[PDB]
Ligand binder design. Structure first.
Ligand SMILES: COc1cc(N2CCN(C(C)C)CC2)ccc1Nc1nc(Nc2cccc(F)c2C(N)=O)c2cc[nH]c2n1
Length: 297
């Protein structure tokens, strides 16, 4: 790692509270002073790497930040700055003020003690979420990333309820092996060919996308609840897939069934999902999407 214009002074960052454990260590909510032009102060998420990490891991932490330097998508959580001089090393992100998509959906259940007094997501809101997630994933696919970790908990929710992909889903290649499958990669979100032969492609991400939609419409229940990890592996490898949540919108169901095609070739691409959903989204969508951008080539 070598510093550049992404270097941000430590003293600019004030930390406010722990948000939770990220893949590398504790993530914090904070404030950053003069980190974006036209803004005195910016609400940030600050990633850290925890004490127990090897030097190799510490370098891997910064390399992840390095990769996000080349991402400018409204529907992927963006990097704001890096504090690399001295320890602790800090990776500064746009804050996603409504948390991960899984916890956000759980807050919307009838029986949630942390319920914001708002109704569960409308069909309209759900479709918007889908196109947003799909647009972020399309960007990553164009950048040549296979995510491998698409799940509601890995997607974030902004202040204005925009949903973004938290990261490019960076995993060491070893976690793709049969030992770890049957590990950091979640078997309840995995395509049958990934489960079978460790094939991870943009098509297997589409399968995981379908599970996200299932999480959206079940308000983040656990996929295949009542089955063990061994039972899911077989069930899914034999041609099985999730039942539709009670009174799930038919439009979302049709989207999930497209994703859960056994033959990867028969599944949609992320651009195709955005295309399928594009004609009834928020008027701001074309202005911010990768789909409608000059970069979508
Ligand atoms: C207030 O903002 C948040 C609240 C919660 N709440 C979660 C629900 N909690 C309940 C269970 C107590 C309260 C905190 C969770 C996340 C955010 N915002 C946020 N988090 C990020 N990363 C993570 C935070 C915690 C755990 C994680 F695994 C991650 C991660 N996957 O990286 C980022 C990264 C960029 N921007 C981010 N913004």
């Amino acid at each position: 790692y070598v510093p550049d214009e992404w270097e941000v002074s430590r003293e600019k960052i004030t930390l406010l509270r722990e948000l939770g454990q990220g893949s590398f260590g504790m993530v914090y909510e904070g404030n950053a002073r003069d980190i974006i032009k036209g803004e005195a102060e910016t609400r940030v998420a600050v990633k850290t790497v925890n004490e127990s990490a090897s030097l190799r891991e510490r370098i891997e932490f910064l390399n992840e930040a390095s990769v996000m330097k080349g991402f400018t998508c409204h529907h992927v959580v963006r990097l704001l700055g890096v504090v690399s001089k001295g320890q602790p090393t800090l990776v500064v992100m746009e804050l996603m003020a409504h948390g991960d998509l899984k916890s956000y959906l759980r807050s919307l259940r009838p029986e949630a003690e942390n319920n914001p007094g708002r109704p569960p997501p409308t069909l309209q809101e759900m479709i918007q979420m889908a196109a947003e997630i799909a647009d972020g994933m399309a960007y990553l696919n164009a950048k040549k990333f296979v995510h491998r970790n698409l799940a509601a908990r890995n997607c974030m929710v902004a202040h204005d309820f925009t949903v973004k992909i938290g990261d490019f889903g960076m995993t060491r290649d070893i976690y793709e092996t049969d030992y770890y499958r049957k590990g950091l990669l979640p078997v309840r979100w995995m395509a049958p060919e990934s489960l079978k032969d460790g094939v991870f492609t943009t098509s297997s991400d589409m399968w995981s996308f379908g599970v996200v939609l299932w999480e959206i419409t079940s308000l983040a229940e656990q996929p295949y609840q009542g089955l063990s990890n061994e039972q899911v592996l077989k069930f899914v490898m034999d041609g099985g897939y999730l039942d539709q949540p009670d009174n799930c919108p038919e439009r979302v169901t049709d989207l999930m069934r497209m994703c859960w095609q056994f033959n990867p070739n028969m599944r949609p691409t992320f651009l195709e999902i955005v295309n399928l959903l594009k004609d009834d989204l928020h008027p701001s969508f074309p202005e911010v999407s990768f789909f409608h951008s000059e970069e979508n080539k």
